[PDB]
Amino acid sequence: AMLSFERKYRVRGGTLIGGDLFDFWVGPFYVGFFGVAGFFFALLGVLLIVWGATIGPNAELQTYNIWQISIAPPDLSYGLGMAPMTEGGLWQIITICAIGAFVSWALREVEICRKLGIGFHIPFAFAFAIGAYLVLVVVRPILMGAWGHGFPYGILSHLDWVSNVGYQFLHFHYNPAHMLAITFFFTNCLALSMHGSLILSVTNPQKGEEVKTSEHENTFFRDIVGYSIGALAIHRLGLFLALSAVFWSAVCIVISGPFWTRGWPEWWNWWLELPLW
Amino acid sequence: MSAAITEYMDVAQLTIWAFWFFFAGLIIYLRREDKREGYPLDSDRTERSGGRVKVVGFPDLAEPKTFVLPHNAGTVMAPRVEAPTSINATPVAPFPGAPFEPNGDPMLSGFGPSASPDRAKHCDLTFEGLPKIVPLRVATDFSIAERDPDPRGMTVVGLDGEVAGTVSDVWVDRSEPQIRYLEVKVAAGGKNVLLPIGFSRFDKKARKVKVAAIKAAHFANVPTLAKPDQITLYEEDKVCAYYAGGKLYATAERAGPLL
Amino acid sequence: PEYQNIFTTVQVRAPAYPGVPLPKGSLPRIGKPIFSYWAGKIGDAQIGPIYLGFTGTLSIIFGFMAIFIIGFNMLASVDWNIIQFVKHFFWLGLEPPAPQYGLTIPPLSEGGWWLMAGFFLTMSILLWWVRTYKRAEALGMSQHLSWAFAAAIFFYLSLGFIRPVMMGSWAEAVPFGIFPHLDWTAAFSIRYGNLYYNPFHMLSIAFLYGSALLFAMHGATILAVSRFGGDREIDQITDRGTAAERAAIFWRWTMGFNASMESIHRWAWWCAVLTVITAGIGILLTGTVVENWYLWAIKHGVAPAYPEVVTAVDPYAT
Amino acid sequence: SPDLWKIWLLVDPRRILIAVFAFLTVLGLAIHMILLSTAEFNWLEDGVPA
Amino acid sequence: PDLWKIWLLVDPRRILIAVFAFLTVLGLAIHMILLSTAEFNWLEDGVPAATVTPVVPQR
Amino acid sequence: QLYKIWLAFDPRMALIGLGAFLFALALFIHYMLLRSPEFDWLLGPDYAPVTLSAGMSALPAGR
Amino acid sequence: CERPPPEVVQKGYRGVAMEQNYNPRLLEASIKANLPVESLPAAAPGGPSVSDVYENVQVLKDLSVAEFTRTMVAVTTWVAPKEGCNYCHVPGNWASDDIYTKVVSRRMFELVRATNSNWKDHVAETGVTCYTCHRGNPVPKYVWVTDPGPNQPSGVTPTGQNYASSTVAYSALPLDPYTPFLDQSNEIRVIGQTALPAGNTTSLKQAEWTYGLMMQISDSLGVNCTFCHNSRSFYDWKQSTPQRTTAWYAIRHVRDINQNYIWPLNDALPASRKGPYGDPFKVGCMTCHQGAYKPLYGAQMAKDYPALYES
Amino acid sequence: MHKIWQIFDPRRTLVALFGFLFVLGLLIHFILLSSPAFNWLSG
Ligand code: BCL
Ligand code: BCL
Ligand SMILES: CC[C@H]1c2cc3[nH]c4c(c3C)C(=O)[C@H](C(=O)OC)c4c3nc(cc4[nH]c(cc(n2)[C@@H]1C)c(C(C)=O)c4C)[C@@H](C)[C@@H]3CCC(=O)OC/C=C(\C)CCC[C@H](C)CCC[C@H](C)CCCC(C)C
Ligand SMILES: CC[C@H]1c2cc3[nH]c4c(c3C)C(=O)[C@H](C(=O)OC)c4c3nc(cc4[nH]c(cc(n2)[C@@H]1C)c(C(C)=O)c4C)[C@@H](C)[C@@H]3CCC(=O)OC/C=C(\C)CCC[C@H](C)CCC[C@H](C)CCCC(C)C
Ligand SMILES: CC(C)=CCC/C(C)=C/CC/C(C)=C/CC/C(C)=C/CC/C(C)=C/CC/C(C)=C\CC/C(C)=C/CC/C(C)=C/CC1=C(C)C(=O)c2ccccc2C1=O
Ligand SMILES: COC(C)(C)C/C=C/C(C)=C/C=C/C(C)=C/C=C/C(C)=C/C=C\C=C(C)\C=C\C=C(C)\C=C\C=C(C)\C=C\CC(C)(C)OC
Ligand code: HEM
Ligand code: HEM
Ligand SMILES: CCCCCCCCCCCCO[C@@H]1O[C@H](CO)[C@@H](O[C@H]2O[C@H](CO)[C@@H](O)[C@H](O)[C@H]2O)[C@H](O)[C@H]1O
Ligand SMILES: [Ca+2]
Ligand SMILES: [Ca+2]
Ligand SMILES: [Fe+3]
Ligand SMILES: [Mg+2]
């Protein structure tokens, strides 16, 4: 079922691949070629994860507990080759399916953008999240030389991976790109709360008042911090902050081990050893 | 008091469960807020039922909230009943979910990327009640920054490279000072048409405005303004939607697929 | 390519807008507004004016006192050597009172200065909250920002005041320093058994991740429909244009459901607010009702088990 | 060179004077800092005289 | 022989700014690199037979 | 008659596209040789690995 | 900035990310800086005994004269190659104890023999040699004294932290973990071993002190925390590695070395071998390890010298 | 004097002065409480 204003937008065409073959909607979803590919990439990957949970690390430890299900990457001894299915090969197949699903999702978004005649900012922004995932499971494992460097597929198990990778550098907070990425993450959250607040407070003002104006919006933050970025620019800023956070997060992890093996605080010794002090 | 509620239950476990109940209510609230526009849904389920089954999903719709507009422009209800609008298109196949093919010239069909709702036939207003989007010839206190080129006089070039016209005036937003439209003197006819800044790519060196959306010939059919010095919210949508239709309709290859 | 609307190509100049008139009796806005060309490239050119009222003045005075105390103690920690201050600046800090002092006021260099900096900073933040409330009230606006700020203040107070008081120890609180407060963050997680297993830490991350996801989604969405005037969201809320429709239709086609031009900002508001709400709750639960988060996760079946390929003989079991 | 004065038609002495003075001050500060950080040339901590 | 034509392309004030700034940064960087080495640190190499408390061996 | 590529691809994009691709490929292959200890020329022509004696091991025990 | 790939050693389950990363070129330089000394040729069997010939031999009594001479040649290369036998001996008089270096080195023989014989839970058939710490220097390069931290104004109590120090691998953690943990026996554990609070009143600040010690341990061995821990549960010995058990004994071994061998030698030692607080140059990790997971990367030198084991 | 209120707003001056005095009064009390020799809330 479509929105009450949607029918006049359900136009034929705008596909990247497939033309009229898959150019249709299933319920609310647009399918297209990459809807078919993406759905069955996701369906296979999800089913393989369930199968990976069905056999578990072994029969004794096997669990369907949603927190404890974990599909682990191969051992590092397998290098960049393919591992047996029960020894990390399933993880490698799921990773391929995940890449297939994520990219197909982005390309399906491109076809939707073409149908609606809008900018391609959303698929472009989604590519940053995909790029971060690709860095974690492809770029970094290849730079290190083994698929086993990828994180396991498990709701809690991949937190143990993050924890131990962080402590492979003894104090991960000192990673400079990590510090930059967190600053962008924290600033983005602050900017999002500010933007959500301003729009809501202007369109839902005090009782007995009419809807406010864009003049009120500029004045409000000028009255608080002396500057207003503007109605258009806050969306530029929000996109910039979120994308910079992910870009620098991708940088921080890809330099942690491939381009830096020491403890992260030791990296700052370049500044401490400047001859000025 | 203590941390252990039972032999197994503890305070942290209670706190996380308490959040899940609040969060469930929050998601229900947010989804209901989402449904203040475009609901009930346009569905075959309603069509075969003769309108006896309104498609709302879960949660159902919220009670209409009131937006009181400034300068006595009126009051709108966020959940509102909207009259059905016919579409200048026909289904390309008779199965559900099939797309529609526009009727007539797709650039003039008002369908697909060229479709737009009918907004109010009133201009957006500044806080002082003046029209917000106006030409530079009536917003005399506004000017182009010195470091940036003046759009006026630049040659407007369509997607094919052929010259479409020249920039006569610049329409600015009097609330947040910025360009929103470029008034183009069309080379063919001479009738002035508006060109949204979002469809204009400036070539500062060549003093050219490149419009990839539509060809030079398509500029003659841009919807025109009733009054020459102001634009209603309805007209703004009509103009922007027309250029957007060119992103899919202007050239045959723009329909796709690539390969 | 097509205009991506990332940078303003041609900027427009008008007389500086003084701002929406304030209610009678309010103080005038200070600062002669100026225009920055580079600020106008990405956003608005106008800088200023600002409203500096009675509340803002007190917040600034309280805030400077806290900041001066912190920076003075950092300088004292390097024995007044300004060169060594610059070299070690990231490592310097005003450090909380020692564990043996409990909640009592210790001598100046043993936590006394930290308490003063903590109190003065807290007062300035609280006064700044009143300022944000007053600025919204003076413009006839709702108090969404002050609520969201209060949520952030709740987390801030949980870190440095409420949790230390509940543990009865100022030594639990956060040092005033760049690397020192990162050391505190790591040590907090280590001390209380891997904060990754704190479910409210999990929730806070989900909302922090969601804040970036939503602003990337919403920021890209508005820019994608800014060719239709989607940036003017008030217009699209009161008079739904094709920008709001195409924005909603894009997301309905992508993921089967969508928000509205107004409700997306409610999703945004709650996602950011819940980041600090659950962060505060997770902090308040840690060390008070849960000692070891990993062991709490084991008790509740959250922590996965791994095959024992490596193990250590426990020397305490001898 | 006997014709070096023609530079000033290209650089306004206002900008040159500020840049020269700011750079020299930072250079002098930096060199003093470098000397103070060395044991041999820290004139304040070396114990001479007496 | 005909190299003077380059400033017909580039403003010869900005190039003068660039070359001074680049040479200064390059000059400082080379000096820092030499100071960071034991072989070419001319201030802490002992020669000319330096003349300048219990020690902390680990720090 | 091989000009037809220039009637369907702009000379400018291809030349910049070719340069970026060729530079990236050359950087990539140069890095791959540096990746291999056999072709790592940055180790020097007369590079000799350290001799290990008396039960030495370069790496700690693995898994 | 380093060039990938590193040499990676997996120590835990796949996907747990318990791995050691080594830059191959940095590892190469470290190995070249930590090469063992070749053992002397074995002494001729039989011959006159130490007790019959030498008067003032109190430790190496069970030796043959050939083996005893071999030991003195060995320790000369290990401790004072640039000073010869006269570094620890009065010239002309072999039996005289009238120089502090002989009194110290006699106690150092006991330190080595006790280590090789009673601390195999740590040194495990590899043992130690005077070279392991001294490396041909009379003063071992990597020693520690009680650190006052940076100078403070006279009315300011030091925090002992918030200062970039190589002792804690350039973090702002408490920069003197040697004194509480490697000389004194302060409790290192800070983590509660129950889900719900059960009386562990350990402060968050004490966790920073343990973190500082582990930063020094990891830097001393050139390893990361996952060499001995699963960081998801630092406390848990079941999820730890066997090297954590060895490190536990090593801490007690270091405490024994400093308390029972170095500290009682303080009066014999000159002022130059003492810190600002007056404590002697003390042994920590990195005195033997010097940035390697095993001293000299596990080179086995002590087995060739019978004088380095208790009778 | 008397002209100091001709170039300084009485409202802005008074709130600023009272703000500094209140902060200064708090700071001195805090310092005295930090000092063991002048903590009046001890035994
Ligand atoms: C391992 C054994 C040897 C070695 C084995 C080889 C082998 C085998 C080869 C090289 C080749 C090269 N080696 Mg070698 N090389 C070694 C060590 C080095 C070292 C070093 C300091 O260690 C350096 C700096 C180099 C450098 C080079 C380059 C001179 C050359 C790569 C050409 C290239 O990149 O074109 C790509 C970049 C271009 C710009 C191409 C230009 C053409 C296009 C059409 C121009 C378009 C311009 C347009 C404006 C686009 C501009 C680019 C974009 C704007 C980004 N080698 C080691 C010691 N080396 C290759 C060679 O000889 O190529 C000629 C080659 O086959
Ligand atoms: C040795 C430590 C002693 C002590 C020694 C001193 C000494 C010495 C002084 C004080 C002063 C003060 N002490 Mg005491 N005091 C102690 C313990 C306390 C305790 C406590 C719970 O233990 C409290 C709450 C106080 C509180 C106070 C305040 C009443 C006063 C500071 C006011 C101020 O900073 O104005 C600044 C903030 C303002 C806003 C000033 C403006 C005031 C208003 C707005 C103007 C009204 C004008 C009016 C007509 C004129 C009268 C002025 C009145 C103060 C109102 N003391 C201990 C026991 N205390 C000071 C004092 O007496 O000041 C009056 C002072 O010099
Ligand atoms: C780059 C800035 C931020 C961002 C942006 C962003 N994300 C996006 C988009 C954008 C612009 C979209 O357009 C797209 C979307 O449509 O969102 C609604 C999306 C999206 N971001 C999503 C999630 C997501 N984004 C995240 C992060 C971010 N997204 C960044 C912070 C995270 C984090 C931080 O964890 C998550 C979880 C989805 C809701 C959606 C993309 C949906 C999609 O690709 O659907 C196809 C795939 C499936 C339906 C299932 C695939 C299953 C696999 C085959 C198997 C499982 C593999 C996986 C590796 C398992 C791992 C599990 C463990 C980690 C627990
Ligand atoms: C939804 C949760 C997120 C959030 C929300 C949030 N933060 C907020 C708000 C909200 C809703 C505000 O309304 C408030 C604000 O004003 O935002 C612009 C704020 C704010 N969040 C801030 C910071 C901040 N938020 C953070 C985080 C977050 N904020 C969360 C991620 C962080 C992090 C990640 O660490 C930081 C650092 C501030 C910018 C602001 C609150 C400002 C404040 O309290 O100011 C107090 C003043 C001082 C301490 C200093 C005053 C002293 C001066 C330095 C003296 C010297 C200069 C002087 C001013 C010169 C002029 C003098 C005149 C007299 C002439
Ligand atoms: C033939 C046949 C049967 C084929 C199979 C069917 C096929 C192929 C279907 C194709 C689609 C596919 C592959 C479906 C399978 C996979 C499934 C089920 C996907 C479900 C979709 C999905 C991933 C949902 C996840 C959503 C989640 C959890 C988070 C998203 C982020 C989030 C919290 C969003 C909520 C807020 C919203 C709605 C934001 C969107 C939004 C934004 C950001 C605006 O700015 C905006 C501005 C103005 C108006 C509206 C909006 C608006 O709606
Ligand atoms: C212009 O400024 C000059 C140059 C003069 C001096 C500037 C110095 C500089 C550069 C200082 C820089 C400081 C920096 C970089 C600080 C960084 C601080 C950080 C990162 C802090 C992070 C977290 C800190 C937190 C969360 C602390 C919270 C503390 C709280 C909430 C404490 C509250 C304490 C109270 C309310 C005390 C109560 C006790 C009462 C009874 C008062 O006690 C007597
Ligand atoms: C049997 C072999 C050894 C001999 C002969 C030996 C000899 C000596 C001598 C002569 C000194 C005093 C040097 C001086 O002050 O000038 C000394 C000091 C010291 N030795 Fe050893 N040593 C041996 C083994 C070790 C080992 C295995 C360690 C490490 C555990 C060690 C650590 C130290 C330390 C820390 C000092 C104090 C620093 C100093 O005074 O030089 N030594 N040793
Ligand atoms: C920088 C990375 C490291 C971190 C963050 C770390 C953290 C910790 C923590 C928090 C404890 C206290 C455990 C408790 O409270 O029960 C601890 C103890 C311990 N760690 Fe580490 N550690 C690190 C590196 C190492 C390494 C490399 C080793 C092995 C060489 C090691 C061996 C030990 C041992 C043996 C104990 C127990 C000490 C005792 O009980 O006396 N750690 N570590
Ligand atoms: C995985 C994510 C998506 C990336 C797509 C590419 C996946 C991997 C590419 C396939 C490469 C397969 O290459 C193949 O790998 C296996 C497993 O290491 C190698 O096998 C070799 O190493 C393994 C373990 O390291 C040993 O058990 C085996 O004795 C040895 O022959 C084969 O010698 C090699 O021919
Ligand atoms: Ca001197
Ligand atoms: Ca010299
Ligand atoms: Fe918005
Ligand atoms: Mg600290």
Numbering used by the authors:
A (entry chain L): 2 to 278
B (entry chain H): 1 to 259
C (entry chain M): 2 to 319
D (entry chain W): 2 to 51
E (entry chain Y): 3 to 54, 58 to 64
F (entry chain 3): 4 to 66
G (entry chain C): 23 to 333
H (entry chain Q): 5 to 47
Share the article's original sentences:
The photosynthetic apparatus of Alc. vinosum consists of two light-harvesting (LH) complexes, LH1 and LH2, and the reaction center (RC) complex. The Alc. vinosum LH1 is a closed ring structure composed of 16 pairs of αβ-polypeptides, 32 bacteriochlorophylls (BChl) a, and 16 all-trans spirilloxanthins that are uniformly distributed around the RC. The Alc. vinosum RC contains a tetraheme-cytochrome (Cyt) subunit and four BChls a, two bacteriopheophytins a, one 15-cis-spirilloxanthin, a menaquinone (MQ)-8 at the QA site and a ubiquinone (UQ)-8 at the QB site. The cryo-EM structure of the Alc. vinosum LH1–RC complex identified three forms of α-polypeptides (six α1, nine α2, and one α3) and two forms of β-polypeptides (ten β1 and six β3).
The Alc. vinosum LH1–RC complexes used for cryo-EM analysis were purified using two different methods: (i) one-step extraction using n-dodecyl β-D-maltopyranoside (DDM) followed by sucrose density gradient centrifugation (hereafter designated as sucrose-density), and (ii) two-step solubilization by lauryldimethylamine N-oxide (LDAO) and n-octyl β-D-glucopyranoside (OG) followed by DEAE chromatography using DDM and CaCl2. The cryo-EM structures of the Alc. vinosum LH1–RC complexes were determined at 2.24 Å resolution for both sucrose-density and Ca-DEAE purified samples. The two structures are virtually identical in both protein conformation and cofactor arrangement with a root-mean-square deviation (RMSD) of 0.37 Å for the mainchain Cα carbons but they differ in the number of divalent cations bound to the RC Cyt-subunit. Hereafter, we describe only the structure of the LH1–RC complex purified by the sucrose-density method because it was purified under physiological conditions that retained all natively bound Ca ions. A total of six Ca ions are located on the periplasmic side of the Alc. vinosum LH1 complex and are divided into two groups: four on one side of the LH1 ring and two on the opposite side. All Ca2+ are positioned close to the LH1 BChl a molecules, and each Ca2+ is ligated by the mainchain oxygens of Trp44 and Val49, the sidechain of Asp47 in α1-polypeptides, and the mainchain oxygen of β3-Trp46 (or β1-Trp45). Because of the high resolution of our structure, two water molecules were identified as additional Ca2+ ligands; this leads to a hexa-coordinated octahedral structure, in which each Ca2+ resides at the center of a plane formed by α1-Asp47, β3-Trp46 (or β1-Trp45) and oxygens of the two waters with the mainchain oxygen atoms of α1-Trp44 and α1-Val49 as axial ligands. In addition, several water molecules were identified near the Ca2+-binding sites forming a hydrogen-bonding network with nearby residues and the Ca2+-ligating waters that stabilizes the Ca2+-binding sites.
